[PDB]
Short mmCIF file of C-alpha atoms and ligand atoms in Angstrom, two decimals:
data_model
loop_
_atom_site.label_atom_id
_atom_site.label_comp_id
_atom_site.label_asym_id
_atom_site.label_seq_id
_atom_site.Cartn_x
_atom_site.Cartn_y
_atom_site.Cartn_z
CA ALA A 15 102.65 -76.21 -31.86
CA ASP A 16 104.04 -79.43 -30.40
CA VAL A 17 106.81 -77.53 -28.59
CA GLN A 18 104.22 -75.19 -27.07
CA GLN A 19 102.03 -78.08 -25.89
CA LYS A 20 105.03 -79.83 -24.33
CA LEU A 21 106.11 -76.69 -22.43
CA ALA A 22 102.55 -76.18 -21.17
CA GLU A 23 102.41 -79.79 -19.96
CA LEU A 24 105.78 -79.42 -18.21
CA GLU A 25 104.60 -76.23 -16.48
CA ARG A 26 101.39 -77.92 -15.30
CA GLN A 27 103.22 -80.97 -13.93
CA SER A 28 105.74 -78.71 -12.14
CA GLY A 29 103.04 -76.77 -10.28
CA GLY A 30 104.76 -73.42 -10.92
CA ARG A 31 105.25 -70.67 -13.54
CA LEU A 32 107.77 -71.22 -16.37
CA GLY A 33 109.35 -68.66 -18.74
CA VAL A 34 111.43 -69.63 -21.78
CA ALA A 35 113.14 -67.76 -24.62
CA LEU A 36 115.35 -69.54 -27.18
CA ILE A 37 117.14 -67.60 -29.96
CA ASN A 38 118.44 -69.85 -32.76
CA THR A 39 121.10 -67.93 -34.70
CA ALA A 40 120.98 -70.47 -37.57
CA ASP A 41 117.73 -68.92 -38.88
CA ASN A 42 117.17 -65.90 -36.58
CA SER A 43 114.12 -67.55 -35.00
CA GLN A 44 112.71 -67.61 -31.45
CA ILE A 45 110.78 -70.08 -29.29
CA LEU A 46 108.89 -68.16 -26.58
CA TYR A 47 106.80 -69.20 -23.54
CA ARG A 48 105.61 -66.47 -21.11
CA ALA A 49 108.53 -64.54 -22.63
CA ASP A 50 107.14 -61.06 -21.86
CA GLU A 51 106.25 -61.83 -18.22
CA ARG A 52 108.53 -60.67 -15.40
CA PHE A 53 110.53 -63.11 -13.26
CA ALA A 54 112.95 -62.46 -10.37
CA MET A 55 116.47 -62.80 -11.81
CA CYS A 56 118.35 -63.75 -8.62
CA UNK A 57 121.97 -64.78 -9.46
CA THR A 58 121.36 -64.44 -13.23
CA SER A 59 121.71 -60.63 -12.78
CA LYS A 60 125.46 -61.08 -12.11
CA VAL A 61 126.05 -61.21 -15.89
CA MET A 62 124.85 -57.59 -16.29
CA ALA A 63 126.96 -56.39 -13.33
CA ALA A 64 130.13 -58.07 -14.63
CA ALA A 65 129.46 -56.68 -18.13
CA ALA A 66 129.16 -53.13 -16.72
CA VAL A 67 132.63 -53.48 -15.16
CA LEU A 68 134.01 -54.87 -18.45
CA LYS A 69 132.56 -51.89 -20.35
CA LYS A 70 134.12 -49.43 -17.85
CA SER A 71 137.47 -51.20 -18.36
CA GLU A 72 137.48 -50.33 -22.08
CA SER A 73 138.46 -46.75 -21.13
CA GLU A 74 140.43 -47.65 -17.97
CA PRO A 75 143.14 -50.22 -18.76
CA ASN A 76 144.25 -50.93 -15.15
CA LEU A 77 140.67 -51.51 -13.97
CA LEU A 78 140.49 -55.32 -13.80
CA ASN A 79 143.71 -55.32 -11.73
CA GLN A 80 142.29 -52.81 -9.20
CA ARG A 81 142.30 -54.20 -5.63
CA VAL A 82 139.18 -54.33 -3.40
CA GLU A 83 139.32 -54.93 0.38
CA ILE A 84 137.25 -57.86 1.73
CA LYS A 85 136.11 -57.52 5.38
CA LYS A 86 133.88 -59.46 7.78
CA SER A 87 131.33 -56.65 7.33
CA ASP A 88 131.12 -57.55 3.60
CA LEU A 89 129.93 -61.14 4.21
CA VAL A 90 126.32 -61.92 3.19
CA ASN A 91 124.45 -65.25 2.96
CA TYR A 92 126.49 -67.17 0.33
CA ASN A 93 130.23 -66.35 0.18
CA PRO A 94 132.07 -69.48 -1.07
CA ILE A 95 135.08 -67.57 -2.49
CA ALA A 96 135.07 -64.27 -0.56
CA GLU A 97 135.12 -66.08 2.81
CA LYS A 98 138.64 -67.29 1.91
CA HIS A 99 139.92 -63.71 1.38
CA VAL A 100 138.66 -61.86 4.46
CA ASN A 101 141.18 -59.21 5.63
CA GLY A 102 142.98 -59.20 2.27
CA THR A 103 142.10 -57.82 -1.18
CA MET A 104 140.73 -59.35 -4.39
CA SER A 105 141.07 -57.82 -7.86
CA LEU A 106 138.01 -56.82 -9.88
CA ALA A 107 138.87 -59.68 -12.29
CA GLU A 108 138.85 -62.15 -9.38
CA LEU A 109 135.54 -60.78 -8.11
CA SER A 110 134.03 -61.07 -11.59
CA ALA A 111 135.13 -64.73 -11.87
CA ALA A 112 133.86 -65.55 -8.35
CA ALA A 113 130.46 -63.98 -9.07
CA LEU A 114 130.04 -65.68 -12.45
CA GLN A 115 131.55 -69.12 -11.72
CA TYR A 116 130.61 -69.74 -8.05
CA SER A 117 127.63 -67.36 -7.64
CA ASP A 118 129.53 -65.55 -4.85
CA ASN A 119 127.24 -62.89 -3.41
CA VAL A 120 130.00 -60.69 -1.88
CA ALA A 121 131.58 -60.56 -5.32
CA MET A 122 128.27 -59.41 -6.81
CA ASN A 123 128.02 -56.62 -4.20
CA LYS A 124 131.56 -55.40 -5.03
CA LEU A 125 130.73 -55.24 -8.76
CA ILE A 126 127.52 -53.33 -7.99
CA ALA A 127 129.30 -50.87 -5.68
CA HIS A 128 132.17 -50.24 -8.10
CA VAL A 129 129.94 -48.96 -10.92
CA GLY A 130 127.74 -46.85 -8.62
CA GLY A 131 124.98 -49.17 -7.36
CA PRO A 132 121.87 -50.95 -8.68
CA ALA A 133 120.66 -47.86 -10.57
CA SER A 134 124.00 -47.69 -12.42
CA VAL A 135 123.79 -51.38 -13.46
CA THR A 136 120.26 -50.61 -14.70
CA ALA A 137 121.44 -47.51 -16.60
CA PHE A 138 124.07 -49.67 -18.34
CA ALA A 139 121.33 -52.10 -19.45
CA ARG A 140 119.42 -49.11 -20.85
CA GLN A 141 122.52 -47.90 -22.75
CA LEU A 142 122.64 -51.32 -24.47
CA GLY A 143 118.98 -51.04 -25.54
CA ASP A 144 117.47 -53.29 -22.81
CA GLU A 145 114.48 -51.35 -21.48
CA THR A 146 113.09 -54.28 -19.38
CA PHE A 147 115.89 -55.27 -16.96
CA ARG A 148 115.77 -53.69 -13.52
CA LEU A 149 118.24 -54.24 -10.67
CA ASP A 150 116.72 -52.57 -7.60
CA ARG A 151 118.59 -54.07 -4.60
CA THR A 152 121.93 -55.52 -3.49
CA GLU A 153 122.65 -59.02 -2.12
CA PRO A 154 121.05 -60.71 -0.27
CA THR A 155 117.65 -58.97 -0.53
CA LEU A 156 117.52 -59.07 -4.36
CA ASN A 157 116.53 -62.78 -4.05
CA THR A 158 113.18 -62.45 -2.20
CA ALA A 159 111.24 -63.26 -5.43
CA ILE A 160 107.80 -62.39 -4.03
CA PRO A 161 105.00 -63.07 -6.58
CA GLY A 162 103.75 -59.80 -8.08
CA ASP A 163 106.84 -57.79 -7.02
CA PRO A 164 108.62 -56.14 -10.01
CA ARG A 165 111.87 -55.47 -8.11
CA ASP A 166 114.97 -57.20 -9.50
CA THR A 167 113.12 -58.71 -12.49
CA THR A 168 113.35 -59.02 -16.26
CA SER A 169 111.55 -60.97 -19.00
CA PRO A 170 112.85 -64.08 -20.80
CA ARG A 171 112.69 -62.28 -24.18
CA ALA A 172 114.71 -59.28 -22.96
CA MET A 173 117.37 -61.32 -21.16
CA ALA A 174 117.87 -63.65 -24.16
CA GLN A 175 118.27 -60.65 -26.53
CA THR A 176 120.69 -58.93 -24.15
CA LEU A 177 122.73 -62.10 -23.51
CA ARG A 178 123.03 -62.52 -27.28
CA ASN A 179 124.39 -58.94 -27.58
CA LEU A 180 126.88 -59.47 -24.73
CA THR A 181 128.25 -62.88 -25.79
CA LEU A 182 127.78 -63.03 -29.61
CA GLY A 183 127.18 -59.35 -30.53
CA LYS A 184 129.09 -56.09 -30.16
CA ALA A 185 128.06 -54.67 -26.76
CA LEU A 186 131.64 -55.20 -25.51
CA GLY A 187 135.00 -54.82 -27.20
CA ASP A 188 136.66 -57.97 -28.52
CA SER A 189 138.92 -58.50 -25.49
CA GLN A 190 136.06 -57.88 -23.05
CA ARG A 191 133.54 -60.07 -24.91
CA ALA A 192 136.05 -62.93 -24.99
CA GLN A 193 136.65 -62.51 -21.25
CA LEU A 194 132.91 -62.74 -20.48
CA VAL A 195 132.52 -65.88 -22.63
CA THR A 196 135.53 -67.53 -20.98
CA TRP A 197 134.14 -66.76 -17.54
CA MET A 198 130.69 -68.20 -18.37
CA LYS A 199 132.16 -71.36 -19.99
CA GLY A 200 133.98 -71.99 -16.69
CA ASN A 201 130.86 -71.83 -14.53
CA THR A 202 130.71 -74.54 -11.85
CA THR A 203 127.04 -74.20 -10.79
CA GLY A 204 125.10 -75.17 -13.93
CA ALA A 205 125.50 -78.91 -14.54
CA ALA A 206 122.01 -79.84 -13.23
CA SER A 207 120.18 -77.03 -15.12
CA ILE A 208 120.20 -76.25 -18.89
CA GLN A 209 123.28 -78.46 -19.41
CA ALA A 210 121.38 -81.49 -18.01
CA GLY A 211 118.86 -81.27 -20.87
CA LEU A 212 121.42 -81.07 -23.72
CA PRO A 213 123.70 -83.70 -25.30
CA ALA A 214 127.00 -84.22 -23.48
CA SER A 215 129.00 -83.03 -26.50
CA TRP A 216 127.50 -79.52 -26.64
CA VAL A 217 129.51 -76.57 -25.23
CA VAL A 218 127.77 -74.24 -22.75
CA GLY A 219 128.47 -70.96 -20.94
CA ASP A 220 125.76 -70.30 -18.38
CA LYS A 221 124.78 -68.42 -15.21
CA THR A 222 122.28 -69.86 -12.69
CA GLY A 223 120.14 -68.21 -10.00
CA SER A 224 117.88 -69.28 -7.13
CA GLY A 225 115.83 -67.60 -4.44
CA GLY A 226 112.60 -67.41 -2.52
CA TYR A 227 109.42 -69.15 -3.72
CA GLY A 228 111.56 -72.00 -5.07
CA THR A 229 112.83 -69.70 -7.84
CA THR A 230 115.22 -71.66 -10.08
CA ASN A 231 116.82 -69.95 -13.13
CA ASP A 232 119.52 -70.37 -15.80
CA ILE A 233 120.70 -68.30 -18.80
CA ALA A 234 123.04 -69.77 -21.42
CA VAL A 235 124.99 -69.40 -24.64
CA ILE A 236 125.20 -72.80 -26.36
CA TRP A 237 127.42 -74.13 -29.17
CA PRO A 238 125.81 -77.35 -30.47
CA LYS A 239 128.03 -79.74 -32.38
CA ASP A 240 128.52 -78.35 -35.93
CA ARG A 241 125.66 -75.82 -35.62
CA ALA A 242 125.19 -72.07 -35.25
CA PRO A 243 125.00 -70.98 -31.58
CA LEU A 244 121.85 -70.68 -29.48
CA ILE A 245 120.85 -68.39 -26.60
CA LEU A 246 118.47 -69.92 -23.99
CA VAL A 247 116.80 -68.39 -20.92
CA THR A 248 114.81 -70.66 -18.57
CA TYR A 249 113.16 -68.99 -15.54
CA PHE A 250 110.95 -70.83 -13.02
CA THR A 251 109.14 -69.88 -9.81
CA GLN A 252 106.63 -71.57 -7.49
CA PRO A 253 103.61 -70.69 -5.34
CA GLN A 254 104.95 -71.63 -1.86
CA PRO A 255 107.41 -69.31 -0.04
CA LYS A 256 109.60 -72.24 1.10
CA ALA A 257 109.36 -74.36 -2.08
CA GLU A 258 112.49 -76.36 -2.89
CA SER A 259 114.60 -75.85 -6.01
CA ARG A 260 113.59 -77.55 -9.28
CA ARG A 261 116.64 -77.56 -11.55
CA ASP A 262 115.13 -80.63 -13.28
CA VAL A 263 112.37 -78.38 -14.71
CA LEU A 264 115.01 -76.21 -16.45
CA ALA A 265 116.70 -79.32 -17.87
CA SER A 266 113.33 -80.60 -19.15
CA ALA A 267 112.57 -77.24 -20.81
CA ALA A 268 115.99 -77.18 -22.50
CA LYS A 269 115.42 -80.70 -23.89
CA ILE A 270 111.97 -79.75 -25.23
CA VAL A 271 113.13 -76.63 -27.11
CA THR A 272 116.32 -78.15 -28.60
CA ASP A 273 115.05 -81.60 -29.64
CL1 LIG B 318 105.90 -72.81 2.26
#
């Protein structure tokens, strides 16, 4: 009850719409707030795309080493790693790391294209038992985040359950699961989001996202000191098209649900 009141007060102060799902594997419990509503995923969808490539690699051993050409025509609106490789190639492993650890949007588009497009990433989610996730578009348009638009959305409940399967469960083979966890633990974009609301000693693998309407998101697997792991999804979006990012709201939500 107190946790619910605190999340409601945070949402009201923020001026926007907040979605939270925590899974505590110590006791198989959940803390949920707007957890069945849809939110634009933005960059957080890169986890599903990278996982689809990892699954494909289980039956194709040379897959992560496969080379992909990077051209000026591939550049989109945020290309921190790919811009350094124009006119050469990157491997699928390198593209996966760039997408997950730097939010590189060219890298996301190469993962999407490799597996057959947004409908193939969605069909992979369905094969895992996630019947909520939908990836409709490529970068950069998947980030528009218009209120009421179901494109490129999922719910906090669904994304927490799927992230648990991918990182702690058996969706991927042992080598592939370990690779995903290692990539997420090395993320560089998350220190002001969920991590900022947790003790310094806790270990985190996370993926952030941001987009139109001040959309500010983070999804994480968390190893608290001497405790069973947690899965946490914090999604946030605002009423104004040009609203600024609010990573502090995600930090505040993480503190509330883990105190
Ligand atoms: Cl505005």
